Amino acid sequence: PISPIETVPVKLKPGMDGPKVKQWPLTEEKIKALVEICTEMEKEGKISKIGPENPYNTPVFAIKKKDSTKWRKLVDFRELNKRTQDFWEVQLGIPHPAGLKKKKSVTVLDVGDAYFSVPLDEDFRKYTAFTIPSINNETPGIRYQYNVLPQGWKGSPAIFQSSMTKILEPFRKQNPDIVIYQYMDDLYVGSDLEIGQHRTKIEELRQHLLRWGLTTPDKKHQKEPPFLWMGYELHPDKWTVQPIVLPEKDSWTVNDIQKLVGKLNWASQIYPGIKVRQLCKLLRGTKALTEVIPLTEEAELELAENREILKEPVHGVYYDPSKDLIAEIQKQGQGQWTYQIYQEPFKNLKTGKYARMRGAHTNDVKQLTEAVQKITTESIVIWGKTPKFKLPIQKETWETWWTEYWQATWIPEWEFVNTPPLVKLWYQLEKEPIVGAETFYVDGAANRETKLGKAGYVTNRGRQKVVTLTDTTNQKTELQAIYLALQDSGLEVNIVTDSQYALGIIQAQPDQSESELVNQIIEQLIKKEKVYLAWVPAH
Amino acid sequence: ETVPVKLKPGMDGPKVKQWPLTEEKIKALVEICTEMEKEGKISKIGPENPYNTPVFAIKKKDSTKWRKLVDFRELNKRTQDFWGIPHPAGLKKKKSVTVLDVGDAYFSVPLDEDFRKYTAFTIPSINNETPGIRYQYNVLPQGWKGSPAIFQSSMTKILEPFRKQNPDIVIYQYMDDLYVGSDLEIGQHRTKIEELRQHLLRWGLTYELHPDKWTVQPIVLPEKDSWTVNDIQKLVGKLNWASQIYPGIKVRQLCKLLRGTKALTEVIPLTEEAELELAENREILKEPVHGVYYDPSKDLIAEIQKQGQGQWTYQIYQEPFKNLKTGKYARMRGAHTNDVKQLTEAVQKITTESIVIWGKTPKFKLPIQKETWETWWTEYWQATWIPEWEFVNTPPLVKLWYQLEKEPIVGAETF
Numbered sequence: 038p039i040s041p042i043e044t045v046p047v048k049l050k051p052g053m054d055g056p057k058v059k060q061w062p063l064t065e066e067k068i069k070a071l072v073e074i075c076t077e078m079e080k081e082g083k084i085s086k087i088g089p090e091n092p093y094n095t096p097v098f099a100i101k102k103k104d105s106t107k108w109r110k111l112v113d114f115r116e117l118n119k120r121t122q123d124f125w126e127v128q129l130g131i132p133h134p135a136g137l138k139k140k141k142s143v144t145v146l147d148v149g150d151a152y153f154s155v156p157l158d159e160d161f162r163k164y165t166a167f168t169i170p171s172i173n174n175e176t177p178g179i180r181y182q183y184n185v186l187p188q189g190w191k192g193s194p195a196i197f198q199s200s201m202t203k204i205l206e207p208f209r210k211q212n213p214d215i216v217i218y219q220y221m222d223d224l225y226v227g228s229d230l231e232i233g234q235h236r237t238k239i240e241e242l243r244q245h246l247l248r249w250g251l252t253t254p255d256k257k258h259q260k261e262p263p264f265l266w267m268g269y270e271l272h273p274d275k276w277t278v279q280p281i282v283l284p285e286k287d288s289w290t291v292n293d294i295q296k297l298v299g300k301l302n303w304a305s306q307i308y309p310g311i312k313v314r315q316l317c318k319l320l321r322g323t324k325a326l327t328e329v330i331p332l333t334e335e336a337e338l339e340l341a342e343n344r345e346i347l348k349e350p351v352h353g354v355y356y357d358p359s360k361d362l363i364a365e366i367q368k369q370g371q372g373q374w375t376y377q378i379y380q381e382p383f384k385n386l387k388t389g390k391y392a393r394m395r396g397a398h399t400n401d402v403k404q405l406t407e408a409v410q411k412i413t414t415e416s417i418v419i420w421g422k423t424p425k426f427k428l429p430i431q432k433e434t435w436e437t438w439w440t441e442y443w444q445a446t447w448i449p450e451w452e453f454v455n456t457p458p459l460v461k462l463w464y465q466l467e468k469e470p471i472v473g474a475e476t477f478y479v480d481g482a483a484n485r486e487t488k489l490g491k492a493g494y495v496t497n498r499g500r501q502k503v504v505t506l507t508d509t510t511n512q513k514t515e516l517q518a519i520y521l522a523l524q525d526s527g528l529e530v531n532i533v534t535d536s537q538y539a540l541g542i543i544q545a546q547p548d549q550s551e552s553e554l555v556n557q558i559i560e561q562l563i564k565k566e567k568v569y570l571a572w573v574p575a576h
Numbered sequence: 577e578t579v580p581v582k583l584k585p586g587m588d589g590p591k592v593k594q595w596p597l598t599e600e601k602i603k604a605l606v607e608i609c610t611e612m613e614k615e616g617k618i619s620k621i622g623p624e625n626p627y628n629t630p631v632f633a634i635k636k637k638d639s640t641k642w643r644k645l646v647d648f649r650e651l652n653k654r655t656q657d658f659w660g661i662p663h664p665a666g667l668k669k670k671k672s673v674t675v676l677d678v679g680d681a682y683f684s685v686p687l688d689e690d691f692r693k694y695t696a697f698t699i700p701s702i703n704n705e706t707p708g709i710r711y712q713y714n715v716l717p718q719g720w721k722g723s724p725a726i727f728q729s730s731m732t733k734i735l736e737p738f739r740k741q742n743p744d745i746v747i748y749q750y751m752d753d754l755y756v757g758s759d760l761e762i763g764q765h766r767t768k769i770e771e772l773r774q775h776l777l778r779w780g781l782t783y784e785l786h787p788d789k790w791t792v793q794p795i796v797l798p799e800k801d802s803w804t805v806n807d808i809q810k811l812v813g814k815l816n817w818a819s820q821i822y823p824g825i826k827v828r829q830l831c832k833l834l835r836g837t838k839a840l841t842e843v844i845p846l847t848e849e850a851e852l853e854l855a856e857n858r859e860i861l862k863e864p865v866h867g868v869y870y871d872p873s874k875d876l877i878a879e880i881q882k883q884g885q886g887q888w889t890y891q892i893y894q895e896p897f898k899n900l901k902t903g904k905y906a907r908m909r910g911a912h913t914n915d916v917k918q919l920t921e922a923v924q925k926i927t928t929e930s931i932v933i934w935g936k937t938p939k940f941k942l943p944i945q946k947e948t949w950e951t952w953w954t955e956y957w958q959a960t961w962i963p964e965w966e967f968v969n970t971p972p973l974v975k976l977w978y979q980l981e982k983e984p985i986v987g988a989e990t991f
């Protein structure tokens with residue numbers, strides 16, 4: 038009993054051939070189980086006894102699971118898979134709890150062995166051939182081939198989903214106020230109908246599937262809310278996070294610390310406060326995965342503060358398309374941002390944070406701009422709309438910055454919300470030379486090969502200085518020349534250099550850099566009442 | 577009937593993923609595609625077709641009507657060549673050109689059955705609660721290069737009668753568009769264009785440029801009562817950079833005025849020798865560099881620099897420092913707070929000029945981060961084609977130099 042569903046035309050990769058891997062040897066026991074199982078499937082209609090007309094072959098194996106300790110079977114399609122054509126990506130962008138609309142009911146149907154419910158392209162069938170061994174390689178073993186989507190075969194998931202979509206089209210046209218979500222072997226049918234009308238509609242869907250061959254599930258196996266969707270539990274009324282457990286031990290290997298640092302990192306997206314600085318710190322200079330690193334007092338401590346935060350009940354809300362979508366952002370440390378998207382105050386749909394993106398050189402506004410875009414991309418996917426933004430940056434700071442930056446940049450509809458620390462412009466290089474202020478003509482030169490160089494300046498006022506550096510580079514001297522000018526001058530300074538890097542500093546005006554040296558220069562820049570950087574061609 | 581199109585030797589169809597779409601857009605594409613599906617132009621497809629080409633919806637000006645735009649850039653590139661119409665040099669010397677979307681005419685012609693797989697596209701669904709809706713084309717797709725080609729006999733056929741009735745008007749076809757240039761006055765021009773549309777409508781089909789105005793603009797250098805150490809330093813740096821273009825540009829005499837550790841604000845008296853040098857520089861910059869010609873067998877390139885305050889500069893070239901054309905773009909009314917809009921608008925303007933002048937779109941170097949562009953350009957896209965692009969970091973001096981371009985005395989006076 039299979040299906041009156043049209044098959045999908047399947048082919049092999051560019052001019053290849055089907056697998057011809059030999060049948061692994063098995064005992065009379067393992068064989069007798071497989072023989073049993075294959076006489077059954079031979080009748081369910083799923084496979085078919087073949088003969089000498091088929092050079093193809095895949096290795097069949099015998100494993101006993103736990104459910105019944107019963108001898109089961111496994112066909113190793115790795116080869117056939119690496120030879121089967123490419124299909125269009127099966128669903129790899131899955132729903133997110135924050136984007137689900139709440140429903141009066143959701144009922145999960147099991148289209149379990151639905152792979153074996155869908156016919157195989159009769160043309161492709163020969164490739165799925167396998168052999169039931171004989172008692173220690175005796176006469177010919179029993180030969181077969183699949184007549185349905187094989188478990189573990191490459192195209193099954195894609196073809197199963199498609200087949201399900203065609204079959205489901207009628208039902209969906211006939212009652213649009215019903216949302217069906219296809220995932221793996223489940224159908225999450227939900228709706229806003231009266232629980233009785235709902236149960237009724239599901240029975241119809243079930244009976245509809247019956248027409249097409251999908252045998253109805255047992256009450257024992259049925260799934261009931263809350264549903265687990267990786268880190269979350271969806272309850273009809275809202276979602277919660279799955280209990281995340283940090284195990285207490287007296288011996289932590291590097292593995293345990295890495296696996297731990299992982300789970301914790303995942304939690305930083307949901308729980309407010311998670312920290313792994315002292316845990317990561319235990320990784321320094323490790324010589325093996327199995328290496329036991331003792332937890333310092335400080336690691337012990339943060340681990341404990343974590344166990345505490347993680348025992349808080351972070352819950353959430355579902356999406357209501359008639360309410361505003363709002364996204365607020367907080368600069369949580371330099372380069373780190375936290376955000377939470379909601380519609381109604383304190384009822385979050387989603388929260389999360391972006392790691393300290395350690396780049397070669399930016400500024401807060403640019404970075405705020407980037408967090409805003411990542412969020413926007415997220416929202417389009419999740420909700421197909423972009424959130425109104427509430428940003429901890431004054432509208433004046435944004436106009437002054439974006440309007441003059443060399444790069445195109447933007448922030449969608451946003452509004453200012455004062456929730457310190459507010460992001461701002463740490464310094465703004467002067468637009469024109471400072472009259473009055475001292476001028477430093479700076480210069481640094483190094484021997485790229487001996488890495489011995491000098492750095493200094495001479496000012497219109499007479500002051501001067503030179504410093505010798507070892508294990509430097511020319512860029513470092515050029516930059517250190519600038520550094521000294523800043524250190525040695527008053528609150529208003531004019532600095533001239535032929536450093537091409539300083540020309541980049543003048544355009545972008547970075548407030549964070551990959552270089553400690555440039556960093557120090559930033560701390561000085563920020564410190565002055567006025568700075569004017571003037572670049573001039575070298576030589 | 578159907579002509580056997582194919583892919584270039586060794587090429588495989590596009591497998592470009594669908595960028596996420598807004599709900600407004602998915603809803604329209606859905607509407608639009610069920611229709612196309614009913615009319616027989618596109619057909620739902622299976623998972624055995626591994627290809628894909630991004631789709632999105634744009635706005636047909638004056639209407640709420642959403643238009644579908646497929647990004648066939650990858651397919652086009654992989655599609656065999658058919659060696660379009662030779663570019664009419666006359667088109668640039670026309671007082672006023674108008675653009676028309678004749679892309680609607682292709683649905684009439686069928687697509688080689690064996691090529692259709694390659695036109696696969698997908699409509700996403702919010703939160704991915706629904707699998708994408710796959711379709712492929714049964715007809716000539718809009719935005720594919722192969723369309724205007726295959727539909728050429730039919731296009732010239734319908735066009736002749738008008739071309740002869742009005743032999744002073746030029747008609748050029750790029751992709752789904754038709755640019756019609758004439759030296760007639762605005763009214764007589766447009767009335768003559770609508771005459772063309774009526775003509776075009778009795779089969780099945782439905783921007784105001786002024787090419788002769790596109791002035792080649794030079795670099796004007798600063799002049800001053802007195803010059804400061806800084807002014808000179810600023811000038812010397814631009815001139816030194818500019819010597820990669822005009823090698824006769826010199827800063828030695830000026831550079832001597834910069835000998836000394838003096839205050840940036842201090843005024844320096846210009847030596848006559850320094851003053852001749854500057855005057856000789858102004859003379860050099862008075863005209864475009866010599867020997868720059870367009871090589872048809874070379875990629876055309878368009879670089880843009882954000883000048884700030886809604887201003888933008890660009891230069892179309894093929895070889896570094898050998899410009900075919902330079903210009904400025906001031907934002908359009910309404911674009912006040914949005915850089916991406918100003919940018920996409922600029923790219924569209926620049927791209928139509930390129931089409932108008934050399935009959936091909938350039939490859940852009942955009943002063944924007946990849947993600948800012950990819951996330952929002954469609955929102956403001958209005959042309960049927962889409963040029964190629966790369967994201968770049970604007971060198972501080974390239975910007976500094978082109979900002980020096982000459983602007984009008986008062987401006988193009990529209991009384």
Ligand SMILES: CCOCn1c(Cc2ccccc2)c(C(C)C)c(=O)[nH]c1=O
Pocket residue numbers: 132137138139140142143144216217218225226227228262263264266271272273355
């Ligand atoms: C009981 C709540 O489950 C979550 N839920 C669901 C089911 C659901 C279950 C697992 C993964 C995705 C979706 C749906 C759909 C897909 C029926 C819905 O619309 N709203 C909702 O809250």
